[PDB]
Structure of Flagellar P-ring protein:
Amino acid sequence: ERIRDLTSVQGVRENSLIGYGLVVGLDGTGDQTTQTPFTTQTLNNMLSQLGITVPTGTNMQLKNVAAVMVTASYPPFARQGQTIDVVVSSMGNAKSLRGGTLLMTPLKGVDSQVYALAQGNILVGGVQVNQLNGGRITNGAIIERELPTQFGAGNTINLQLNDEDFTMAQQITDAINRARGYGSATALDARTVQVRVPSGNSSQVRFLADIQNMEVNVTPQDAKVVINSRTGSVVMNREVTLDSCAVAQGNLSVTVGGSLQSVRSSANLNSVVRALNALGATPMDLMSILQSMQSAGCLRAKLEII
Amino acid sequence: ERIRDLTSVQGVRENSLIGYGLVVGLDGTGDQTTQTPFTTQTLNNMLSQLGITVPTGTNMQLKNVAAVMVTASYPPFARQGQTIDVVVSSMGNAKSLRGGTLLMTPLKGVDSQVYALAQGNILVGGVQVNQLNGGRITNGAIIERELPTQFGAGNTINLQLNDEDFTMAQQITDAINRARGYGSATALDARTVQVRVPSGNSSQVRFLADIQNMEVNVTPQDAKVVINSRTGSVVMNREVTLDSCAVAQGNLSVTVGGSLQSVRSSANLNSVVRALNALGATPMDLMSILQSMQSAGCLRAKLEII
Amino acid sequence: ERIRDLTSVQGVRENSLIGYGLVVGLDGTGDQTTQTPFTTQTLNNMLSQLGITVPTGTNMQLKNVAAVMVTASYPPFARQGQTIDVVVSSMGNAKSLRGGTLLMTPLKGVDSQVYALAQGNILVGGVQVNQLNGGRITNGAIIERELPTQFGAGNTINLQLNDEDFTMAQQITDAINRARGYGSATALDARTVQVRVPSGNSSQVRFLADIQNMEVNVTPQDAKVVINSRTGSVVMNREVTLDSCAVAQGNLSVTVGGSLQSVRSSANLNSVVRALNALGATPMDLMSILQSMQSAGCLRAKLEII
Amino acid sequence: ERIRDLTSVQGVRENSLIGYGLVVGLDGTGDQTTQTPFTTQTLNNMLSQLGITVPTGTNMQLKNVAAVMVTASYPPFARQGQTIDVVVSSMGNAKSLRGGTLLMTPLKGVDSQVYALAQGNILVGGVQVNQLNGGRITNGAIIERELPTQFGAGNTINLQLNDEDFTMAQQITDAINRARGYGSATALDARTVQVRVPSGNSSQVRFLADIQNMEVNVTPQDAKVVINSRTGSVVMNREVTLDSCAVAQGNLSVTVGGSLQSVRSSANLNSVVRALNALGATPMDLMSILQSMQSAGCLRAKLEII
């Protein structure tokens, strides 16, 4: 696996942008403004900013405008000329956003500063039906401000691991130590590896580029079972080991001569799958069987309800 | 890939224009002015600007006029004589904009200055039905003001990368360094490359023209999976690697002998596709299976809900 | 079994994050705000933070917004640039969260400090139906604060065992003592093993990485039976031993010549399963039979109602 | 039988944790808050702790939240980083807890101190129907405080027997005396055996580990019959002896020539079973027959109504 596939850089981080705006067009299917006054209020605010002053006492029963919230994603090292994608989601009573248009929404971050301006056409999908109050605009926001970053300062860069592991951190440190000279990398914990980098933006970029594509062997992570129980999904890891036991579950019986099937000890994932398949059960029954076994041991893994 | 296909220029940036206007004609299907007084108010304002003063107390039940918002796109280095396309979207209660005409809308930017004037005929499309409250006018706006730009000043131009990558920035810098002499380009971060350019508009334009068409080999970007879950779409990258595991999902069973299918370790995208296809599942089930696996590792990629 | 599969590290611990937020989009199926005023109140608070001040007296009957609680999981040694998964669960009257979007929720820990900011798109599953008021966002929260940790201090690390056992702790201590020199590890109790580690982050990480993958033979844990009685599941351990007895249960009779079946003494799990299967009973009857036997001895194991 | 299978250690004891919390999600099927005000009150308390102050006069008719009680199990020698399973049970009017999530419940012991914090996803089972107001979370609570224990102090450890017996205590003491030197173990009563242990945590752990796996022959415990009479279960011990008698029960007659069957003297459990089976009776009749015989002697065992 490449280093980039399991590790992020300390200075490279993403930021979240938010904003409020209006979507026009829509072929009806807009907000019922009698229940969403803020749509009309913000439309009037925009019109006043453009040069039209609507009288205070007005019906304002328009159905081609929907008030929406836009979520963006400030990319690392973003420049002013860059364009980023945005997600537009209806707020009030809008039935659909099929062919609407966003109107210059100023996107704001955690520090309440306008970082981008979003405007574009919504794309939504055409029984599993599509979500038609939520759309995406590709390159629908233009950045206006730059985050001051500390990349290229000092001489230590923290490669931050995903899915923390002392062994994986040691493997990454050793791989970098073989590639470069002695003392190039040093593991700080199960998640961070400090690499000594020369001063200067260019040389740091070159070193990170060379490091990122580098291949590292992945040690066996952990015996882990994932039970969702909300989407009816069960996933078992490669290192999951199963211990000999006996399991009895409602309405289940041996094929053949009754209930209380036996489960054999199995050190391989294929053997674990075969043993759990001999115990004929649906995934819904499988979750209960797995939890009951884990309560008694009998399952050499940790199971997480996800 | 050409440099232009993955990189923008620092001085070359796009601006967003907005405006409010009226669309006339429409074969009925206009605003219900009893619920949208601003349509009548702005029509009266336009008539007064032309020389007709409507009395204050009037019915104003006209159905051939629709109040619309126009969105434009100020192109880089735009001149006064240029014409740009605009998007016209209904505001109030208009049923359609099939054959309407826009009436000299002054388009405004973020700094509230009129940059273009938009006037033209709307084009809209003729069960998947077309959006007939949203249209486009080709060359429907004429520019009137020029943005002061800093292009051609100094001696450093920032080639700004899309889809930030330290390796891609290093590749671009190296390619430019091979093409030109030493020190021509220098990578500043994962997204910016500073190229040293001679003074003068003509020589900067020549250098950028020569650089833009240049071919650069694209390194493997990243193992990444995209799940939309709103349009029912799943996309997997070329570098997505799949680790051996066992997956159980509701109503799914081995073809053949029951639930809890096995997924083999696979380092190739074709092998990943084959392994996930042996697990017979619809895309809706595939999203849940992929998320559950990623929770347990078992999927050597990062998945983003888009 | 690997040491990592049955032991956690003292400094490596997980923390729980909580937060409150809003989900927008949803294709209707949102909160009935007449019964959930806090949804509208917090939406108004967010709008005021963005720059829109809704009047106090408003209908606020919007059905595209749902108030939700987000639960996160602060990983050990977490860095600021890291992203973690979150679980979004509806609070009020929301019918579904099929295609919603979370809006910058500040996640808080036990000490009431904001540790992460969560924003992203919800993924929910497509008779066993899926839970559609509960979803998960993968990498849907970005960390903002770092927990001060004491890892890399002192010279003693406590390997903490899961499923406490004096014999397992002694086995782990002996295995480490064979691998390293004398006095490297010392068992403190049935659950803790103190390993002497050299000073420094790098060397502690290296020692823990070498120790974690190490194989240790697992002694027979304990004779234990698990009865759930809520999911209808019975699990029996490998060491469960069965003593000779006679059992009579309602509507059960010998196959063949009446009630009061006999159960033979059996020192093997397979023999125990055969003896309990000769007594033809469903798991529901099996729980009562097992509890009744344990009341009389006759069952060389402890049974836990789980 | 291993010593661990019939004996607990004096210092090794379990503690019970309790707590109150909320479960969110649930696909409706939550509390009817008009009849359970404490659900809304505690939700408001949590929101205030997060930073949202709900007005005092509110409808609070939300059906996605259920007030629950969580029961945990503080394991012996528990550390701060450990995780333990919890049981979540509905309190008010909740119809189900199918896919809910627990929200940071502080678990408390007998001394009213917070010992763990519980948060996670509930797992419940999918005519014998499952209990869907009661679920379990695996590793759903993280410990925060450590019980001060006296293990490793003094030089005497009390092996405490389950199912008290003077003969079993003597057998355990003799077995330890053969394994170690003279005076190593001394029986104090039918339930306690004092073993002399050297000072120090390490040596005490080693001695207990060596002792625990040791095999000891189990003497015949006692002639005992268990009648449940609530689940319709009758269990008879291995030492149950039956004396010659005559039994008459309603609607029962000799197969063949009428009522008042004879029961032969039988010193073996198989012979006892055969004698009671010749008397053709259901378990319900068997309980009455056994109690009536025991009133007259005729049954060389003690019967307990369990």
